């Protein structure tokens, strides 16, 4: 899953 601490919460894995 997306790591909101390192990348957008709606990243490609969302």
């Amino acid at each position, epitope marked *: *899953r*997306c*790591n909101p*601490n*390192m*990348e*957008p*919460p*709606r*990243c*490609w*894995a969302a």
Partner: antibody
Amino acid sequence: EVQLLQSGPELEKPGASVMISCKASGSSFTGYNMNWVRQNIGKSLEWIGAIDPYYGGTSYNQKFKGRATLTVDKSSSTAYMHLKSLTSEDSAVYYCVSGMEYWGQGTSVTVSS
Amino acid sequence: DVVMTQTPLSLPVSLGDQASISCRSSQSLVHRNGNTYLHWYLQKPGQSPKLLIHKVSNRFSGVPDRFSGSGSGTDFTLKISRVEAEDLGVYFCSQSTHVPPLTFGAGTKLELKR
């Protein structure tokens, strides 16, 4: 505290393939994506790709041209990176990186005839 | 892809000195969602990299106060207020605003003066 254990040093011939594993434990996981990054002799870092352990989706660095294949074995908390059509350029230390926070110990890959 | 340029490439210091490392990105790393995904890692000799700072200025778990990140847009700086021996190594910035691919600077080597 994610602990990531990588498989050992690999030696392959030009044209061949290599598969490296990364065993995740801790700590522990929030199920973050597993990334793979290599580091060449010059110490520069190149991101290869990432896979989501949950639904299995992936994002690849286009520059690898699909030579790279990331998989997860959910049943064993193990991630894998497979790289084909190896050349000397691909000689590097390969790291798995959980959610871009925690790095494995690295796997040396030497491509040589 | 976003090119990350770090300077200087090598930085000699004495223990106790303040040290400062810069990272410039070829594009703004401010995401549409208003966050800036600029991060800093340290790789000690013989080891794997470890995360120090995320999203510009947030110290990662276990990272001491002497490390501080700042900057915005395309200009960023990691400062160490009083250098310790355990701090010597290669510092890399990375960005995950514009991906794929995630990208890294080429690294800055913090070394000891004599």
